[PDB]
Design an enzyme around this catalytic site. Structure first.
Site, PDB file in Angstrom:
ATOM      1  N   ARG A  45     -74.886 -53.804 -13.555  1.00 20.58           N
ATOM      2  CA  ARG A  45     -76.087 -53.398 -12.713  1.00 20.58           C
ATOM      3  C   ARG A  45     -77.267 -53.562 -13.523  1.00 20.58           C
ATOM      4  O   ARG A  45     -78.260 -54.034 -13.112  1.00 20.58           O
ATOM      5  CB  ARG A  45     -76.025 -51.894 -12.296  1.00 20.58           C
ATOM      6  CG  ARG A  45     -75.053 -51.585 -11.100  1.00 20.58           C
ATOM      7  CD  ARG A  45     -75.350 -49.853 -10.504  1.00 20.58           C
ATOM      8  NE  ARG A  45     -75.199 -49.043 -11.317  1.00 20.58           N
ATOM      9  CZ  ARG A  45     -73.914 -48.727 -11.285  1.00 20.58           C
ATOM     10  NH1 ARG A  45     -72.846 -49.284 -10.933  1.00 20.58           N
ATOM     11  NH2 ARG A  45     -73.510 -47.567 -12.271  1.00 20.58           N
TER      12      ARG A  45
ATOM     13  N   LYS B 173     -92.075 -43.908  -6.719  1.00 21.51           N
ATOM     14  CA  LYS B 173     -92.138 -44.140  -5.310  1.00 21.51           C
ATOM     15  C   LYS B 173     -91.074 -43.140  -4.822  1.00 21.51           C
ATOM     16  O   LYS B 173     -90.045 -42.988  -4.854  1.00 21.51           O
ATOM     17  CB  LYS B 173     -91.610 -45.591  -5.068  1.00 21.51           C
ATOM     18  CG  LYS B 173     -91.578 -46.005  -3.899  1.00 21.51           C
ATOM     19  CD  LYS B 173     -90.314 -46.848  -3.194  1.00 21.51           C
ATOM     20  CE  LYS B 173     -89.228 -46.054  -2.960  1.00 21.51           C
ATOM     21  NZ  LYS B 173     -88.270 -46.928  -2.330  1.00 21.51           N
TER      22      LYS B 173
ATOM     23  N   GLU C 172     -94.292 -43.883   0.649  1.00 22.35           N
ATOM     24  CA  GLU C 172     -93.777 -44.906   1.595  1.00 22.35           C
ATOM     25  C   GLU C 172     -92.994 -44.225   2.907  1.00 22.35           C
ATOM     26  O   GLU C 172     -92.042 -43.305   3.088  1.00 22.35           O
ATOM     27  CB  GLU C 172     -92.502 -45.496   0.953  1.00 22.35           C
ATOM     28  CG  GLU C 172     -91.491 -46.136   1.859  1.00 22.35           C
ATOM     29  CD  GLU C 172     -90.455 -47.094   1.139  1.00 22.35           C
ATOM     30  OE1 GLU C 172     -90.350 -47.224   0.163  1.00 22.35           O
ATOM     31  OE2 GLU C 172     -89.658 -47.645   2.097  1.00 22.35           O
TER      32      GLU C 172
ATOM     33  N   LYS D 133     -96.886 -47.686   0.915  1.00 23.18           N
ATOM     34  CA  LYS D 133     -96.163 -48.633   0.866  1.00 23.18           C
ATOM     35  C   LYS D 133     -95.416 -48.565   2.386  1.00 23.18           C
ATOM     36  O   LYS D 133     -94.410 -47.800   2.675  1.00 23.18           O
ATOM     37  CB  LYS D 133     -94.618 -48.386   0.141  1.00 23.18           C
ATOM     38  CG  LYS D 133     -93.574 -49.566   0.085  1.00 23.18           C
ATOM     39  CD  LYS D 133     -92.619 -49.304  -0.551  1.00 23.18           C
ATOM     40  CE  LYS D 133     -91.304 -50.306  -0.670  1.00 23.18           C
ATOM     41  NZ  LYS D 133     -90.135 -50.153  -1.273  1.00 23.18           N
TER      42      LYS D 133
END
Lengths: 358, 366, 358, 366
Positions: A65, A156, A197, A239
């Protein structure tokens, strides 16, 4: 009659958020709304990684990752198009090739480090079957303060709305907006610029008009919740999804049409003060992602806000393929990544050309 | 003009919560609103136990906290006055002297086991300084299902409102009401009857009139949020503060007055369907709590809901002293406890006699 | 800490209406909720009168409408079952045969004179086709004050809701609630006890469950608006529709079912302080009105408010048929009226006996 | 799992006003937002004519009032500045020398004719003393359509908010916002482009920050109410007050502070789709109204909307004094008017020279 002495902070009109971080959040917003630059979303969950590492025979592991992020974050040259990187909690603590943690590496190289702070989607348990809320508010300030100390300056949080039968429930519309608003306030109180978002998903058979109506309806309530919680407008970002037809509509839309519907919906719901709108790709193809952003940035409709990108898939699809999870593919993957990042950089400028994508 | 087929659940008018536990919720409410009975609140935090162990000079240990509850839970014949007990997370997994867990113990004694599910107060971060919100919604259904499995059939969550300069911020009025409503929905989905506690604290110099205004204002918004979230009214309860003068107002109200104001404020804000209001002692003396409750139950004003109690301090302070944290004090401790229990049982019925009670009682306001 | 001195009236928690009429309003309410009594609704518009004078051949004239009211009012002994009379603007100025104006005639007999203050329905111009709003707020205080000086001590205003496709628009639900709420406040400021009528119309093919859902949804919003405008709960009355199947659904509900749904809905939406609920007959037959009311006053569900009637049709139908517009029909017409009035009086007491209508 | 077929128009997301005048309403907006062009406000109430003719000593009559309007509505070459005129009811019926009614006249001269449709301020009867509501919604469409027939293409309605003790009551914030929002919908359905006037009065000793806060708070709700009622944003305009310190504040803000505070408060509450903002003078001198606008039009802050004017006093004041009332003063009168109008047209473009105006401009405050 009677006159009382109260705290000015108890009056409704004085609900605006007060934080000593204000000046800094605005400096960060400025960095994130740099002409020709956008945000690289690299915050995928360990489970979403599986859906990426699988088509390239890459065992989804902690080390692999880190390599997946490294593929992009250490792709010298992407900084010219990427002003900020939304990091996954795991990555924030991983080091680059030079021993620097990624936040240090990005900062030292002129890129603002960001962090996904929501704790995942869960069943709404109200409204219609299929609708989901987002968890994460409990202990948020403690989590965010720790990210701040590590180097992150923006975050976010994502809430999703699912168009079913051409509509979405009010339970979902109200609740998810209140979640997003509370999230933005706690974010600013922690020194992190919040990227709000409110994604009206592309899943479904609805057409672009239905997406337009639901998008407008969903977004306006998000703004009201934001006003209700006294958010510092000059210190946040949106977003959203672009306004397009659903993935199963079998119908497609022209760049200019998407631009018209998207720009018009934002304009009808967002306050002129909103600093920027970094679109999510979610569902659209790499090329469509650039074709649409380009058109949006050529729109005759009003749009005081910076219109750019906050893509994950649209900036990675080709890269991962060429990369193939192999060290011998880093060159190809980064070439592919830089090309996609450059196409979108020019799209933000409205200078994109389909020709450059063959 | 144009038509479209939508899921009925997507229509605003069809937002009432849907749970398979409805019947059970309603039955529990019925059990919790039995004439002459009230709820015992023994859900204090480990930190709150230390403050109570102070008068008796007891060490705040896990074992001592168990005895602290057993003192009351294993008091022979308390079910005649207690219909339900709000337990603390810890006590839920502790066993009684016969081996079974308190929930199993209580359930066999025909007493409904409850659990405090909120995760504590935190700074509001909006509104005015001093205001606080309550955390605990994240992962709520999971924790609640586990409690349900252990025996709990109802729960309690508390939000507080601090009167300052005669008012509270709207940020606090809206947000905490919203938290309470969401909590009520998650509880009912988990099979637990929610006890919504919107507490306008007695802290301050404010008078009974200011407490009356703020209470009406704070409570009506709680009701608004509940309707928006589609709470099952037949399956929930309220645990509000009584309307009284501020602890530092320097004044004290008469039972009749407290009754008037409290019942007036409930009627003006609460839907007539609300099953019951289980008052909190919140700082009042043991006698005051019983006096006021009695007057409430003798009010000529509108009050369709079961009006009783859900006291912690007003039911333990005396029994606690008598006990002394010693084994020898159990008999004395339980007699005091069972006495206050009997007194409040009487007050619930409006047949409380101040004669049969103490001739003096000191404040409990921390 | 930055303080400020403001008017107590500028603080949200202190918005309860302030009027010198309070005690009088509460006295009026006290009168209107006299056990065993209800209100006679006689405020039919000139247009509605034509609809009733037709099946008896009476020319819709000023003198004939006066006589129409006189039939009911000048019925000796009606003050026994009727506590209040809702009058039409025209009637307020008309005179009974003894020279007293109808308001004077009512007062003298201990019956409160009431007045319909709204100015009729008009297209909503928002929401769905077929939805309507109610005009009348402009210059309201002036009008109400004039009626007050004429003897009126309470009033009525009607807003309607049309169930279509099992629902009604939020536009309709919010706007009509706001309208009723303002109406209540202006009335109390004028000395009139407002009878709030939020009618979910019986018209339609919907079933009792649909009526229950819409009624609860509509009613709770009316309540919410009354709180926003700070109504004096102790001084107002509700005139709702009973929860029953739609007129064209072809279904029937037992008095016990109607009582259960109606009492259950009111309880889930109305605050406990609400003084009384005077049901509209609208659609129901003379007997159903009596039966359902009786069933409601025998409901084991919570209902702290006085539950009575505010009928027009259900109290005048049979009487009109016997009167026939003839002076030689007053005796019978009047007998028919007192009969119905007495039945509903017993229904209010929950001691209605259907055999009395056999 | 149950599904039901409903009218798309019964769903919350589909509440946008549907009217056949949309295309036209938008065309009208184009004209009212013409570069360098503002709006003349000649809609003072008859009672406001007496409250403006006193100093100049002029008998108030339908004929003299007609001349008051004739002065500027006929002034040659005013069509290069004023793109629209807000007329009073009476003035709509009156005629111009040529025989055509003012509306008919203006249309020929390109100038769009508008009309003040509200019915005056009244006691709010809720909230704080002194706060006012605005009547006129009853039978509104009937009136509007009559105005449309006479040639009117837009209209204006104004609600006022009074800053008292540095604040206003939510009763007012909410009620006047709903009144304005409803007015907008009824106007658009009647073919008239609505100019929403949510005016925070300059009366009071409040400083600029207090006006910033209240104005932001008031305008928030107006926008919120407009979203609920489904206004066609592309077809309406806003006539707000500028964020300036109170009249009795004992201060004065520079054109830079006024621009910042004003453009910032708009961006923070107005949807980016709002066509334009036509400011009101409110009480500012004839020069400030030009300075401030000019500055407002030199702000680096976000502002996608056409920022122009909709003045009355700060556009007639001088043109009034240099007229007296006789046809002789039609020279100096029309001489002044055409000047002020020339200045604002400059300011609108952000190219206004303060050296062009006088150094002795008193406050038009009343």
């Amino acid at each position: 009659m009677s006159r009382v002495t109260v705290l000015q902070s108890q009056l409704p009109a004085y609900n605006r958020l007060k934080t000593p971080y204000e000046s800094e959040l605005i400096a960060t917003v400025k960095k994130l709304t740099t002409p020709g630059k956008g945000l690289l979303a690299a915050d995928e969950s360990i489970g979403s990684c599986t859906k990426r590492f699988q088509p390239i025979g890459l065992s989804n592991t902690e080390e692999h990752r880190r390599q997946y992020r490294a593929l992009m974050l250490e792709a010298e040259g992407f900084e010219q198009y990427i002003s900020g990187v939304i990091l996954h909690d795991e990555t924030v603590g991983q080091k680059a090739s030079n021993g620097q943690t990624f936040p240090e590496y990005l900062t030292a190289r002129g890129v603002v480090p960001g962090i996904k702070t929501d704790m995942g989607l869960c069943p709404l348990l109200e409204g219609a079957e299929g609708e989901q809320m987002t968890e994460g508010l409990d202990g948020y300030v403690k989590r965010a303060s720790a990210y701040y100390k590590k180097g992150c300056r923006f975050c976010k949080w994502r809430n999703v709305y699912k168009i079913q039968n051409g509509t979405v429930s009010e339970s979902a519309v109200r609740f998810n907006a209140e979640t997003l608003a509370r999230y933005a306030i706690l974010s600013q109180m922690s020194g992190l610029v919040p990227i709000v978002e409110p994604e009206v998903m592309i899943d479904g058979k609805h057409d672009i008009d239905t997406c337009q109506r639901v998008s407008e309806h969903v977004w306006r309530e998000v703004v009201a919740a934001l006003q209700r919680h006294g958010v510092i407008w000059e210190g946040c970002l949106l977003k959203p999804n672009m306004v397009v037809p659903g993935a199963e509509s079998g119908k497609t839309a022209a760049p200019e049409q998407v631009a018209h519907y998207t720009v018009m919906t934002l304009a009808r719901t967002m306050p002129a003060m909103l600093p920027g709108v970094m679109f999510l790709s979610g569902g659209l193809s790499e090329v469509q992602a650039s074709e649409y952003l380009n058109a949006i940035n050529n729109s005759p409709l009003p749009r005081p806000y910076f219109l750019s990108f906050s893509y994950a898939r649209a900036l990675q699809s080709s890269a991962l393929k060429a990369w193939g999870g192999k060290e011998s593919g880093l060159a190809a993957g980064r070439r592919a990544f830089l090309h996609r990042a450059r196409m979108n950089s020019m799209a933000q400028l409205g200078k994109y050309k389909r020709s450059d994508d063959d």
